Protein backbone atom coordinates (compact mmCIF):
# COMPACT_ATOMS: atom_id res chain seq x y z
CA UNK A 1 0.00 0.00 0.00
CA UNK A 2 2.45 2.62 1.37
CA UNK A 3 2.53 6.18 -0.04
CA UNK A 4 1.71 4.76 -3.49
CA UNK A 5 -1.82 3.54 -2.80
CA UNK A 6 -2.92 5.86 0.02
CA UNK A 7 -2.40 8.94 -2.17
CA UNK A 8 -4.10 7.74 -5.36
CA UNK A 9 -6.96 5.77 -3.76
CA UNK A 10 -7.81 7.87 -0.68
CA UNK A 11 -7.47 11.51 -1.79
CA UNK A 12 -9.74 10.55 -4.71
CA UNK A 13 -11.49 7.57 -3.04
CA UNK A 14 -13.35 6.41 -6.13
CA UNK A 15 -14.96 9.81 -6.66
CA UNK A 16 -14.61 11.60 -9.97
CA UNK A 17 -16.15 13.73 -12.71
CA UNK A 18 -16.30 17.28 -11.28
CA UNK A 19 -14.31 17.24 -8.03
CA UNK A 20 -10.57 17.85 -8.77
CA UNK A 21 -8.75 17.98 -5.39
CA UNK A 22 -6.13 20.77 -5.03
CA UNK A 23 -2.42 20.92 -5.85
CA UNK A 24 0.12 18.28 -4.84
CA UNK A 25 2.79 20.24 -2.89
CA UNK A 26 43.41 21.27 24.65
CA UNK A 27 40.08 19.56 23.83
CA UNK A 28 41.60 17.62 20.93
CA UNK A 29 40.42 14.21 19.74
CA UNK A 30 40.47 11.28 22.11
CA UNK A 31 38.81 8.01 21.20
CA UNK A 32 37.46 7.83 24.77
CA UNK A 33 33.77 8.70 25.04
CA UNK A 34 33.04 11.89 26.96
CA UNK A 35 30.48 10.30 29.26
CA UNK A 36 27.08 11.94 29.77
CA UNK A 37 26.79 10.74 33.39
CA UNK A 38 29.46 12.52 35.42
CA UNK A 39 29.68 9.97 38.17
CA UNK A 40 33.31 8.78 37.96
CA UNK A 41 31.85 5.38 38.94
CA UNK A 42 29.05 5.46 36.33
CA UNK A 43 30.95 3.24 33.84
CA UNK B 1 26.13 31.06 -30.92
CA UNK B 2 22.88 31.01 -32.92
CA UNK B 3 19.31 30.29 -31.87
CA UNK B 4 18.01 27.77 -34.39
CA UNK B 5 14.50 28.11 -35.69
CA UNK B 6 16.00 25.90 -38.38
CA UNK B 7 13.37 26.97 -40.96
CA UNK B 8 10.62 24.48 -40.10
CA UNK B 9 9.01 23.25 -43.29
CA UNK B 10 6.05 22.18 -45.47
CA UNK B 11 7.07 18.53 -45.77
CA UNK B 12 4.37 16.93 -47.91
CA UNK B 13 4.94 13.20 -48.23
CA UNK B 14 3.11 10.22 -49.70
CA UNK B 15 3.15 7.09 -47.55
CA UNK B 16 3.15 4.67 -50.46
CA UNK B 17 2.68 1.00 -49.59
CA UNK B 18 5.33 -0.15 -52.06
CA UNK B 19 5.02 -3.88 -52.64
CA UNK B 20 8.41 -5.19 -53.73
CA UNK B 21 9.12 -8.86 -54.13
CA UNK B 22 11.65 -11.50 -55.20
CA UNK B 23 14.10 -8.72 -55.94
CA UNK B 24 17.22 -9.26 -58.01
CA UNK B 25 20.45 -7.81 -56.64
CA UNK B 26 21.52 -4.97 -58.94
CA UNK B 27 24.32 -2.39 -58.85
CA UNK B 28 23.75 1.40 -58.92
CA UNK B 29 20.80 3.10 -60.61
CA UNK B 30 22.37 3.58 -64.07
CA UNK B 31 21.82 -0.08 -65.01
CA UNK B 32 18.45 -0.51 -63.24
CA UNK B 33 16.59 1.81 -65.60
CA UNK B 34 13.87 -0.32 -67.20
CA UNK B 35 15.02 -0.08 -70.82
CA UNK B 36 18.26 -1.96 -70.09
CA UNK B 37 17.41 -4.68 -67.53
CA UNK B 38 13.99 -6.16 -68.49
CA UNK B 39 13.09 -8.36 -65.50
CA UNK B 40 11.28 -11.69 -65.79
CA UNK B 41 7.72 -12.20 -64.56
CA UNK B 42 8.97 -13.87 -61.38
CA UNK B 43 11.29 -11.14 -60.12
CA UNK B 44 9.45 -7.89 -59.50
CA UNK B 45 11.88 -5.24 -58.18
CA UNK B 46 15.57 -4.29 -58.22
CA UNK B 47 17.62 -3.95 -55.04
CA UNK B 48 20.10 -1.10 -55.51
CA UNK B 49 23.04 -2.49 -53.55
CA UNK B 50 25.71 0.22 -53.92
Amino acid sequence: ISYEETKALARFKGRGREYIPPKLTEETLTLVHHTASRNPLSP
Amino acid sequence: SQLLTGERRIFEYLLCQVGVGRSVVVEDEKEACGSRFSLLWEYDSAYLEK
Partner: protein
Protein backbone atom coordinates in the same frame (compact mmCIF):
# COMPACT_ATOMS: atom_id res chain seq x y z
CA UNK C 1 -12.17 25.78 -17.70
CA UNK C 2 -12.57 22.06 -17.03
CA UNK C 3 -14.94 22.88 -14.15
CA UNK C 4 -17.35 24.90 -16.27
CA UNK C 5 -17.43 22.65 -19.35
CA UNK C 6 -18.01 19.52 -17.23
CA UNK C 7 -20.51 21.06 -14.81
CA UNK C 8 -23.58 18.84 -15.03
CA UNK C 9 -26.23 21.35 -13.88
CA UNK C 10 -25.39 23.77 -16.68
CA UNK C 11 -24.91 20.96 -19.20
CA UNK C 12 -28.36 19.41 -18.92
CA UNK C 13 -29.91 22.87 -18.74
CA UNK C 14 -28.19 23.49 -22.07
CA UNK C 15 -29.73 20.26 -23.36
CA UNK C 16 -33.16 21.25 -22.07
CA UNK C 17 -32.59 24.58 -23.82
CA UNK C 18 -31.95 22.77 -27.11
CA UNK C 19 -35.21 20.83 -26.82
CA UNK C 20 -37.26 23.95 -26.11
CA UNK C 21 -35.81 26.10 -28.91
CA UNK C 22 -36.31 23.32 -31.47
CA UNK C 23 -39.99 23.05 -30.53
CA UNK C 24 -40.21 26.84 -30.78
CA UNK C 25 -38.67 26.78 -34.27
CA UNK C 26 -40.93 23.94 -35.41
CA UNK C 27 -44.10 25.67 -34.21
CA UNK C 28 -43.26 29.03 -35.80
CA UNK C 29 -42.48 27.30 -39.10
CA UNK C 30 -45.67 25.20 -38.94
CA UNK C 31 -47.86 28.18 -38.07
CA UNK C 32 -46.37 30.23 -40.91
CA UNK C 33 -47.30 27.68 -43.60
CA UNK C 34 -50.98 28.64 -43.51
CA UNK C 35 -52.65 32.04 -43.23
CA UNK C 36 -55.83 32.95 -41.34
CA UNK C 37 -58.94 33.70 -43.40
CA UNK C 38 -61.66 35.72 -41.66
CA UNK C 39 -63.83 38.72 -42.58
CA UNK C 40 -61.53 41.68 -41.85
CA UNK C 41 -58.82 43.84 -43.37
CA UNK C 42 -55.52 42.37 -42.18
CA UNK C 43 -51.96 43.68 -42.18
CA UNK C 44 -48.86 41.67 -43.12
CA UNK C 45 -48.66 39.75 -39.78
CA UNK C 46 -45.52 38.22 -41.29
CA UNK C 47 -42.63 40.39 -40.11
CA UNK C 48 -43.25 39.22 -36.54
CA UNK C 49 -43.50 35.60 -37.65
CA UNK C 50 -40.15 35.69 -39.44
CA UNK C 51 -38.61 37.66 -36.57
CA UNK C 52 -39.49 34.82 -34.20
CA UNK C 53 -38.04 32.39 -36.74
CA UNK C 54 -34.72 34.26 -36.77
CA UNK C 55 -34.95 34.38 -32.98
CA UNK C 56 -35.44 30.59 -33.03
CA UNK C 57 -32.37 30.19 -35.26
CA UNK C 58 -29.81 32.47 -33.60
CA UNK C 59 -30.70 31.20 -30.14
CA UNK C 60 -30.54 27.55 -31.20
CA UNK C 61 -27.03 27.97 -32.58
CA UNK C 62 -25.77 29.89 -29.54
CA UNK C 63 -26.78 27.00 -27.26
CA UNK C 64 -25.68 24.17 -29.56
CA UNK C 65 -22.24 25.63 -30.27
CA UNK C 66 -21.54 26.71 -26.69
CA UNK C 67 -22.46 23.13 -25.71
CA UNK C 68 -19.52 21.47 -27.43
CA UNK C 69 -17.36 18.86 -25.74
CA UNK C 70 -13.73 19.81 -25.25
CA UNK C 71 -12.34 16.89 -27.36
CA UNK C 72 -14.62 18.03 -30.20
CA UNK C 73 -13.55 21.68 -29.87
CA UNK C 74 -9.90 20.58 -29.81
CA UNK C 75 -10.33 18.62 -33.05
CA UNK C 76 -12.02 21.59 -34.73
CA UNK C 77 -9.26 23.94 -33.57
CA UNK C 78 -6.60 21.59 -34.94
CA UNK C 79 -8.50 21.38 -38.24
CA UNK C 80 -8.35 25.17 -38.46
CA UNK C 81 -4.64 24.91 -37.67
CA UNK C 82 -3.91 22.64 -40.62
CA UNK C 83 -6.00 24.99 -42.77
CA UNK C 84 -3.94 27.93 -41.53
CA UNK C 85 -0.51 26.33 -41.86
CA UNK C 86 -1.30 25.07 -45.38
CA UNK C 87 -1.46 28.57 -46.89
CA UNK C 88 2.34 28.72 -47.17
CA UNK C 89 2.38 25.47 -49.12
CA UNK C 90 1.77 23.75 -52.45
CA UNK C 91 -1.21 24.39 -54.71
CA UNK C 92 -2.70 20.95 -54.04
CA UNK C 93 -2.19 21.30 -50.29
CA UNK C 94 -3.81 24.75 -50.18
CA UNK C 95 -6.94 23.56 -51.96
CA UNK C 96 -7.22 20.26 -50.10
CA UNK C 97 -6.90 21.81 -46.64
CA UNK C 98 -9.64 24.26 -47.64
CA UNK C 99 -11.69 21.12 -48.37
CA UNK C 100 -12.13 21.01 -52.19
CA UNK C 101 -12.59 17.23 -52.05
CA UNK C 102 -13.32 16.80 -55.75
CA UNK C 103 -10.19 15.08 -57.03
CA UNK C 104 -9.71 12.85 -53.99
CA UNK C 105 -12.37 10.28 -53.10
CA UNK C 106 15.97 16.71 -82.75
CA UNK C 107 13.40 16.55 -79.93
CA UNK C 108 15.62 16.31 -76.83
CA UNK C 109 14.87 19.97 -76.14
CA UNK C 110 17.13 21.72 -73.62
CA UNK C 111 15.34 23.18 -70.61
CA UNK C 112 16.07 23.42 -66.89
CA UNK C 113 14.71 25.41 -63.97
CA UNK C 114 15.80 26.18 -60.42
CA UNK C 115 13.00 26.41 -57.88
CA UNK C 116 12.58 28.15 -54.58
CA UNK C 117 11.62 25.22 -52.39
CA UNK C 118 8.09 25.83 -51.01
CA UNK C 119 8.98 24.67 -47.49
CA UNK C 120 9.38 28.07 -45.86
CA UNK C 121 6.76 28.24 -43.03
CA UNK C 122 7.58 31.28 -40.83
CA UNK C 123 7.88 30.78 -37.07
CA UNK C 124 5.34 29.51 -34.55
CA UNK C 125 4.11 33.00 -33.64
CA UNK C 126 2.97 33.51 -37.23
CA UNK C 127 0.92 30.37 -36.64
CA UNK C 128 -1.16 32.15 -34.01
CA UNK C 129 -1.36 35.24 -36.22
CA UNK C 130 -3.20 32.90 -38.58
CA UNK C 131 -5.72 31.71 -36.00
CA UNK C 132 -6.48 35.00 -34.22
CA UNK C 133 -7.41 36.54 -37.59
CA UNK C 134 -9.87 33.78 -38.43
CA UNK C 135 -11.70 34.09 -35.12
CA UNK C 136 -11.50 37.78 -34.15
CA UNK C 137 -12.21 39.54 -37.46
CA UNK C 138 -15.52 41.38 -37.81
CA UNK C 139 -18.11 38.93 -39.18
CA UNK C 140 -18.81 39.25 -42.89
CA UNK C 141 -22.50 38.32 -42.69
CA UNK C 142 -24.96 36.54 -40.40
Amino acid sequence: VEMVARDRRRGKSRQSAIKNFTTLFRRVLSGEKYLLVTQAQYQDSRDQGTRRLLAAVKHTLTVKMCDLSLPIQRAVAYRLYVLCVSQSGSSFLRKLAAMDRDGVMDSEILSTAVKADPSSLPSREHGNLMMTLLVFSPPTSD
